[PDB]
């Protein structure tokens, strides 16, 4: 195409981060570029120091089936979820020093799939009870509820502008919801299977979805159409994690095939391969400035690729 | 910097949790699976009382520290959270043994075999065979003659060829037929016979998990 190729990028793990005892499901990066959160099914939500290869905190979870991680933009709180229906908010920066639970957000009737810290005191959670919900920390109740999906919602993407979020469901619908008015702005039903993972543009104009048919489909807001799809014929394994670059040129996609197939914005070529994991790549993220790339898989191994 | 001393010993804290999770590695993901009105909670409180949302039950004992994972309720798509449970030593499952002839709780209420056929379809859809060893549990056997007697069994069941209209023997043949509807014979389905109020359920699950640990130890120690 018109855009210049990025080429075959040889990407190496600078630092390997070991200490999770079981399969890692989700990770989230902190906004100050050295802090991340990542969680396993042992019952550990771990705050990791990136550049110097350390655990900042080790948070035991009463919910041992956690599927989500959220890290606050301020850096004071983290959010875990899971099969026990409750979004548990833990305070990192306390006088107490231990990372202790502040509020247990109960009320959901399904497994919590992806939560994201909307603000310092506002949390948006996607769940397996077909509904999404924005909650307030101090009240402990749903500020607003996002019903009306047909299938179970599996992923959630934080808006950088903190105004309009998008979530994807099992019934092949990617619905955008506005936080304030609470109603669905746009529906993307042009898909054949579940939305395993979702990630959203730094501008906010586009978002790519993870599927089970090796299609990293992008949908864009103002275009109102569903035409571009990132499909690799050789791969049949599904996309478990989706993450974006700062420029939006480079797409980070972790797969069921224990590899990270990394793509480009327009021409959609295999740009980079991050084959260093025994089991499927379950979670993948970048720092806000973009020095580090974190890949967690089910083999209890978390790797920084630079 | 000086963060090192905080973190390396935090390593062994997780290694302590590596030790304790190995100290409780007789626990695994004992995934109870079931349908509505099969009386799952009755057996759950039975196992709690005799040795005294997903809910985890610690059955800690000197012989075996034990923890049972109740996935009762949780109305959602099975496929997405069944990825979480690949490490199951046993997919514990309850079959509606007692209600031979009932219709589904959905508004139609006229289904012939489709309750049991739907349960069989949930039995079939198993995408992982690495460590799956279904521990089958039979339901109560308190009242037989009226329940067998009021509705004719043979017309509902297409392949059933057995004695009927007798109180005691037909119970044995219908139980042997239900435990003989095991489609996957390469693995071992560890069926047990227990009533709703019958005791010693913990010994049955303990023997079944010991036997499947023996089979996996035969497989991965090259001792097959």
């Amino acid at each position: 195409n018109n855009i210049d190729p990025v080429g075959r990028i040889q990407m190496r793990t600078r630092r390997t981060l070991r200490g999770h005892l079981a399969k890692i499901y989700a990770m989230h990066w902190g906004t100050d570029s050295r802090l991340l959160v990542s969680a396993s099914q042992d019952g550990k939500l771990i705050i990791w120091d990136s550049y110097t290869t350390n655990k900042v905190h080790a948070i035991p979870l009463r919910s041992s089936w956690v599927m989500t991680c959220a890290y606050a933009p301020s850096g004071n709180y983290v959010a875990c979820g899971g099969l026990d229906n409750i979004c548990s908010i833990y305070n990192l920066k306390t006088r107490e020093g231990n990372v202790r639970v502040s509020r247990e957000l109960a009320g959901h009737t399904g497994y919590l799939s992806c939560c994201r810290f909307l603000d310092d005191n506002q949390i948006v959670t996607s769940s397996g009870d077909t509904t999404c919900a924005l909650w307030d920390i101090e009240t402990g109740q749903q500020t607003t509820t996002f019903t009306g999906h047909t299938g179970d919602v599996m992923s959630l993407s934080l808006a950088p502008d903190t105004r309009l979020f998008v979530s994807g469901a099992c019934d092949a619908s990617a619905k955008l919801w506005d936080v304030r008015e609470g109603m669905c702005r746009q529906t993307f039903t042009g898909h054949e299977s579940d939305i395993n993972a979702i990630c959203f543009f730094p501008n906010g104009n586009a978002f790519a979805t993870g599927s089970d048919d090796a299609t990293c489909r992008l949908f864009d807001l103002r275009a109102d159409q569903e035409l571009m799809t990132y499909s690799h014929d050789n791969i049949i394994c599904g996309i478990t994690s989706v993450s974006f670059s700062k420029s939006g040129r480079l797409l980070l996609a972790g797969y069921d095939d224990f590899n990270c197939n990394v793509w480009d914005a327009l021409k959609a070529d295999r740009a980079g391969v991050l084959a260093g994991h025994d089991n499927r790549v379950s979670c993948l993220g970048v720092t806000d400035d973009g020095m580090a790339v974190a890949t967690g898989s089910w083999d209890s191994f978390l790797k920084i690729w630079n | 910097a000086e963060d090192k001393a905080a973190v390396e010993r935090s390593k062994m804290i997780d290694r302590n949790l590596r030790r304790d999770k190995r100290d409780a590695r007789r626990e695994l993901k004992l995934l109870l699976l079931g349908t509505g009105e099969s009386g799952k909670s009755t057996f759950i409180k039975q196992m709690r009382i005799i040795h005294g949302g997903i809910i985890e039950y610690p059955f800690d004992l000197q012989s075996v520290i034990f923890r049972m994972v109740d996935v009762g309720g949780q109305r959602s798509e099975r496929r997405k959270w069944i990825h979480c449970f690949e490490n199951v030593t046993s997919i514990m499952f309850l079959v509606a043994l007692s209600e031979y002839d009932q219709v589904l709780v959905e508004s139609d209420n006229e289904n012939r075999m489709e309750e049991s056929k739907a349960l069989f379809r949930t039995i079939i859809t198993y995408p992982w065979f690495q460590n799956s060893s279904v521990i089958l549990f039979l339901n109560k056997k308190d009242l037989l003659e009226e329940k067998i007697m009021y509705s004719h069994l043979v017309d509902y069941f297409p392949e059933y060829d057995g004695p009927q209209r007798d109180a005691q023997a037909a119970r044995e043949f219908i139980l042997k037929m239900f435990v003989d509807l095991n489609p996957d014979s390469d693995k071992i389905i560890y069926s047990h016979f227990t009533c709703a109020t019958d005791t010693e359920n913990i010994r049955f699950v303990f023997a079944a998990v010991k036997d499947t640990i023996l089979q996996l130890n035969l497989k991965e120690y090259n001792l097959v």
Partner: single-chain antibody
Amino acid sequence: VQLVESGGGLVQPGGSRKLSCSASGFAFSSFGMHWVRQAPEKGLEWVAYISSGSGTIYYADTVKGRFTISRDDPKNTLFLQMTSLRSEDTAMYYCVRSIYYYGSSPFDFWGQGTTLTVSSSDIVMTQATSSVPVTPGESVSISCRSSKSLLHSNGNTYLYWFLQRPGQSPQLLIYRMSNLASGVPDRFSGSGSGTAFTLTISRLEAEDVGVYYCMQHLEYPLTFGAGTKLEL
């Protein structure tokens, strides 16, 4: 919430004591303990450090071997055993709580302080002025100097400012020369070069007229200087 110290009294030079820092209201197991002590007229000077969980025990270079200390983690207590007590150790001992990670706030909360009155290579920091009279509402700048360029390759300066209100603990104000501490208002601001440092106190109010203190933290020994007193 509360840190209590004990072990004071009047002992002749050459005796033995047991200082005891009992702490409560925080997870003491994951915290590192410092033992800053203060001369009755000269400024603070550091004594000892223990990491979280009784690991890397540190000491000041001149009292290496002469002081011993343990920590009772299940009861959250510090046992500073005092051996061969000299006449130059008349001091107000403090029990300092710190934690070390990225984005942390070490030296954040301080102990109340117990007295100890007996009868009768190394980086050194220095102050600018021993006493400065300032009426409130003038945005006073207080500066300090050192003997090393505290611009270590990890990308941050290991400089910690302080303030001691007269009578109680010297609470933290500025850590890493640009990050505001917890419990202090949004009026202080730190700056400085690699070696020289400064601190701007804008729109002064009541009770922020105690003696100020500065800290290098790049190496294991810790030096304070005489401490800049602020007057009216």
